[PDB]
């Protein structure tokens, strides 16, 4: 998984 | 077993030292420690790639004085480090504000004599033995079909853990556990299009795992099934959540009925306690004391006893999921949910997956979802999807680069059926789920 | 280097010559490379909620991580303490990756200078406790005063002070002192029994004084408190988003996370070395519209995503990845650079001493173009304007990405009209980059909020872009 967030 | 028993003694002593240091300067205190040890290996084209030796430790404390709270943690468990950690938490609590819902869990709810749930099944697996299991799984996948042109490897993990919890009511309890897993992931190609998929096995004992050859066969089957997908046109259609993503569909319930969300009025189910939110034939059973269970626990993260409960009974929401703090905000008592849920079970209504395709006739099966896209406060739902288009009750082709959208309230209330094809490797266990309609965005 | 060496080595009974001995133990085997990575860190947090200072924490960690590398292969072990015995035990486990004997010929350890990108002053000690808590109190007051429909406010302050030192068989000897602070604000609004939420915040590599400095004529913390309320009220008013394929105008700043996903991960050297990225083998080809130049820039003073050195001791660089649509190259760590016959780029990053480094982003952004933001909006007959985003996800093999809006509007007849509810956008990475037909003259980066997850390792990053137009993108609304 490649997840990006604030 | 000797290494773990030595660790357990050290951990029990660290908890007792921390509580005694806090006791003269606070009204209450809670202490948690853990140690996890093991190996993680990977292969590429059947040859060793990475060998990683894992050894992690941790102590955390929370103290309370005049209803003011403070917390600190350290990975160093020396007596001097423990002393500094306790002092740091006490110093913080001089400056935080009084909050009467904060505090040690109620004495009457604590697991002073906690049950043995049989979570610890150690294995002595050498690095070379681990590598051979990963290599066998990866090789079985790579040899299945000539369209498999690349790899993301085999992987094997084996770990053991020890956890101890204590508080100022006199609770001091600990337990050991193990987890072993084996997986592979490969890449297939057709006419310039690459697709990737994976398979795995997981359990508390090595003798509970599927064979490496089963894992590679399942990996290859899944990967080849993804080739040459279509992007659907924008439409409304029925949707089956395959078992592997149906578990997550019920998973969104956890945040929506969490006490923390309820007292803050930040959930779309705020006014749904005692109401029918699911079909009248659907019950969600929680079983925290299953022997060897993947998410079994003898007490929660506040030391509170865990109980057999029907969270949903015949479609009706029977309770919130509460911790000590959220229970106090609501005028209630903790339900033993600090740190999450503890094995959910949803029975099938009699149909196989194949029978579910025939009942639906024409529609979408989703097998993989991407993104966040779920609003805690409104229930609005919009997620990226991959799966298969179904017509005449048969799979026609894979699909991808589409979204599915709706609202969780409507989606849960109007479930048509749940299958007997139960996913058994997860916390929440259920079969595939048929919904009557969602908005599919695409071309 | 001298300051960090005294804290991590001398204070734990270690000297330069101990480093020689442990590197020698690794070099008994047939290796391309080995390294020792030392770290200490201190983290604090304070939280305001229900108008009171509810919570605070203080967290400490320290340790050593040891790698042995031969070609594709890495052996790795680590310990939550810094001592000679911890180094010996870790080196002796890691080196078992290969049984064959090596020649023992390591390169002499020798440090060189790098440009300073951020202060070495400890942010946890540089402001008083009551001054820190006054920042949160002010945020609470300003948010509640902004609109009578504000019912709840959660405001948090977080700070980290981190020391690192790395020593390697190729002669590298380097150190960094890393501050990082963050202010976060969340508000709940209510009207006639309907509720919604909004958020703001940011920070960077400096002390807490940044939050009381000027932003366009007001105190920064006040501006951000007002922005969370504005966001919450837009959401409260928002209607169902449309479903299907249409033009999408993306705002400047954090909406750059879509570039980070659609191309950034696709240009990390591990995926391209293995051949699993859609960009593998495409250097010199057109992978994006000719209006697009994309950079990864580790050199930006004071920024959350910057790296004075990366975790292998390579100084941060300005790397042009795509120039006028043409692919120029990949982001590297030392392992993947060697295997590809390329050089380190300043992109070798690890979450901590207890994790392996790999190729990772720093601050990733698109350079400005010639269009005004007004001209971009005026060009759309029907579509969506998305000035703010939440998070999302990418699959680099199949080349699919998915991101969710946090503030969005219809565009009708070249004008921004109705606010619309959160929708997830989906597309192909390369196809999307080729569909970028207008690039704005208004580049900005995010406020200091980015978190990137890869192989279970979370890192601070930055993203940016000007306003830009994607001619066709799939919008996951219900209407
Ligand atoms: Na006491
Ligand atoms: Na420079
Ligand atoms: Zn990322």
Numbering used by the authors:
A (entry chain E): 600 to 605
B (entry chain B): 8 to 450
C (entry chain A): 3 to 481
According to the publication:
Using a combination of biochemical and crystallographic methods we show that E. coli TldD and TldE interact to form a heterodimeric metalloprotease. TldD/E cleaves the N-terminal leader sequence from the modified MccB17 precursor peptide, to yield mature antibiotic, while it has no effect on the unmodified peptide.
We therefore focused on the highest resolution dataset, which had been collected to 1.45-Å resolution after co-crystallization with the engineered angiotensin variant described above. A possible explanation for this could be that proteolytic fragments of the overexpressed TldD protein are comparatively abundant in the expression host, and this particular fragment binds with high affinity, principally due to the Asp residue in subsite S1′, the side chain of which does not occupy the pocket used by the n-pentyl chain of actinonin, but rather chelates the catalytic zinc. Remarkably, hydrogen bonding is restricted to backbone atoms only, such that the peptide acts as an additional β strand that effectively fuses the β sheet and the β barrel motifs in the C-terminal domain of TldD through anti-parallel interactions with both supersecondary structural elements that extend from subsite S2 to S2′ inclusive. Furthermore, binding of the hexapeptide does not result in any significant conformational changes.
